[PDB]
Design a protein around this ligand. Structure first.
Ligand SMILES: O=c1ccn([C@@H]2O[C@H](COP(=O)(O)OP(=O)(O)O)[C@@H](O)[C@H]2O)c(=O)[nH]1
Ligand SMILES: O=c1ccn([C@@H]2O[C@H](COP(=O)(O)OP(=O)(O)O)[C@@H](O)[C@H]2O)c(=O)[nH]1
Lengths: 366, 366
């Protein structure tokens, strides 16, 4: 049987990676066969599309079950889960259980929000392909086979971009200073940063009165959001509102002000000096930092030094798991009595007559 | 001169702490004088109100400037900043510069989101008053004088609450199992958790068909938000919607399902077994964890291993600071050229022909 590769892509970015992977493999094995969940680019390269990438939830669970069986029957030489970790990691695990060799393409950095998920990746995969070196170093800490392959955007973007050519595309004068404002691809980011970014540009106009200001907006919604904010904050500030074209804007500009994330890497490859501005809910940042630091989020467990009360976070905060955790407690029996007694002990440990303690602290210092 | 204490409270919770502190001090010094920013409870105990607590932004900056001068003239024996860290920490610093002894009451855990702010607290204060032991242990790590005084809520809540009395207040039958649902005091929490909490209760009704469900809602907005979600998720689930009364609901219930935060402590003091459910943006949790782990958030600095590009986060993401950071870059001179060359070096380090690397990884495993 000729080399047969199973692929699953779940988004346009993954379809691009998959098509590039197919082309490179056909160079070494022109007879290779490719099947799975394919977008139009993978299909154009010959990927058999059992399902369309756009089809990636009830339906998703059904597809993953079907692929688990079919890939099980097929026994492909390798399975490559292309990104889409919420779908592919579990699938990679199901196939590894059947002895099939699995690769996960792209570090699921956001998805792997806790140690337990790193171990899930390692158990589900024979190898992880990581774009960046510090991602490989991360998995090195866990004896998880990971190969640093470089970043495809670095292959696609030249070392020395043409600033003047980008300015010609955007109609930006070559003699003017030019500032790129990337308020973010997410609504939360745009809402948090757009006003401050506009005020920043207003301040800079005081020094550079002919400063060109280009604003690449990823989609119509984010655009309408930005115009709304601008109308209330800086109605008289003339700017270039662009539909996409963030790459052109950054290659063209002399500096960029970015929310953060993928833009900062693309900006680096554009050779545009940048300043990164970001703002997040302080309350949740504290919770996260609390968790990273202790594995807990709730005060009873911090006071007890153990998982005294059950904490179900993120994907574990789900009805079935919540109900299973509450059922022993609603029984109002032995378990509830033991938690009751520990609660009384901790209550006593922090019952100190704080008003008097504070009053004494004042009097000592005085 | 009789003992003279300066106090600043900025919210109702701080007014309660301040009034309790005033009463305890008057026990030891009935002639003591109290002045500053006082709510109605502090005033009732005799606190001279130079400003009303409700007045705590342009106006806030003006008040803090005025208090910096006046407290400077007064030279109070002690200044106590009662919570409100965004106002009081800077004020405590201004007064310490004048030799005045300062105490900050209540650990500013959320406000102190990074090391630099812990050092700010230590420089601004002679002592921090912390409700909880792990908060004191935190400041012990930084040689920041901190006194663990216990939690005032533990003083106010009895060790053995009366479940049946709370049920009588709420009209809950004594023979029924009762579940408290606290979907959160913030709109983001209610939106994220209300549906899953309702579905959880629906599942539990399958085992406890007479289960009472009490939902304490902090305000009318959060209430309207919850009813809206319930109308779409569980219109036929009968529940008790309460205006506040979270304490009564928890003392009364046999178990509680809580978003998290202050509720979990109050639930512990209510002797109600609990399950903590929480959900936050994965993307921002990763950023935070990224920062906690490295001090950076942007990919260029992670690749460089230093602050190659300026990152201005949270309170530093402000127009004046953003503009000052962009001005050297817009100059498009020596600095921009050095960042350009480093960008080209990092670009080369991750330009590896990833498609071919990935293809080779597949072929090896096959
Ligand atoms: O304010 C902005 C923020 C981002 N982008 C562009 O949007 C693309 C995708 O950004 P995203 O944050 O969505 O990266 P992802 O999460 O998809 O990897 C990037 O090429 C950016 O250049 C933009 O045009 N304006
Ligand atoms: O879904 C909820 C969540 C909280 N609370 C109550 O709201 C009070 C204040 O909660 P918060 O989270 O605002 O604590 P804070 O941040 O003010 O310290 C607490 O006593 C809780 O019992 C409630 O009644 N329903």
């Amino acid at each position: 049987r000729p080399l047969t590769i199973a692929l699953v892509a779940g988004e346009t970015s993954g379809d691009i990676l998959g098509a590039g992977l197919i082309r490179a493999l056909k160079e070494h094995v022109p007879n290779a066969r490719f099947v799975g969940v394919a977008g139009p680019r993978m299909q154009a390269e010959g990927c058999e599309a059992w399902y369309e990438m756009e089809e990636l939830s009830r339906r998703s669970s059904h597809i993953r079950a079907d692929l688990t069986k079919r890939f099980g029957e097929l026994k492909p030489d390798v399975f490559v889960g292309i990104d889409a970790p919420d779908f592919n990691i579990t699938l990679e695990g199901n196939l590894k259980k059947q002895g099939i060799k699995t690769i996960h393409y792209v570090s699921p950095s956001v998805w792997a929000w806790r140690q337990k998920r790193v171990f899930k990746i390692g158990r589900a995969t024979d190898l992880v392909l990581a774009f960046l070196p510090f991602e490989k170093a991360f998995y090195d800490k866990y004896n998880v086979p990971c190969r640093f392959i470089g970043h495809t955007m670095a292959d696609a973007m030249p070392l020395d971009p043409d600033k003047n050519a980008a300015r010609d595309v955007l109609g930006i004068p070559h003699d003017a200073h030019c500032l790129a404002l990337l308020p973010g691809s997410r609504g939360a980011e745009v809402e948090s940063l757009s006003a401050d970014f506009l005020k920043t540009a207003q301040l800079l106009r005081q020094t550079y009165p002919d400063l060109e200001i280009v604003v690449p907006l990823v989609n119509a919604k984010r655009r309408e959001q930005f115009e709304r904010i601008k109308a209330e904050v800086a109605p008289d500030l003339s700017v270039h509102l662009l539909d996409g074209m963030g790459r052109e804007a950054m290659v063209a500009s002399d500096a960029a002000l970015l929310a953060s994330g993928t833009a900062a890497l693309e900006c680096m490859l554009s050779k545009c000096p940048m300043v990164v501005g970001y703002r997040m809910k302080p309350f949740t940042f504290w919770l996260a930092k609390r968790l990273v630091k202790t594995d807990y989020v709730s005060l009873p467990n911090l006071l007890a030094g153990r998982e005294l009360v059950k904490e179900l976070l993120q994907e574990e905060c789900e009805p079935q798991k919540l109900a299973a955790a509450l059922l022993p407690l609603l029984a109002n029996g032995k378990t509830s009595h033991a938690m009751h007694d520990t609660f009384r002990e901790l209550h006593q440990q922090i019952r100190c007559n704080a008003d008097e303690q504070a009053a004494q602290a004042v009097l000592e210092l005085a």
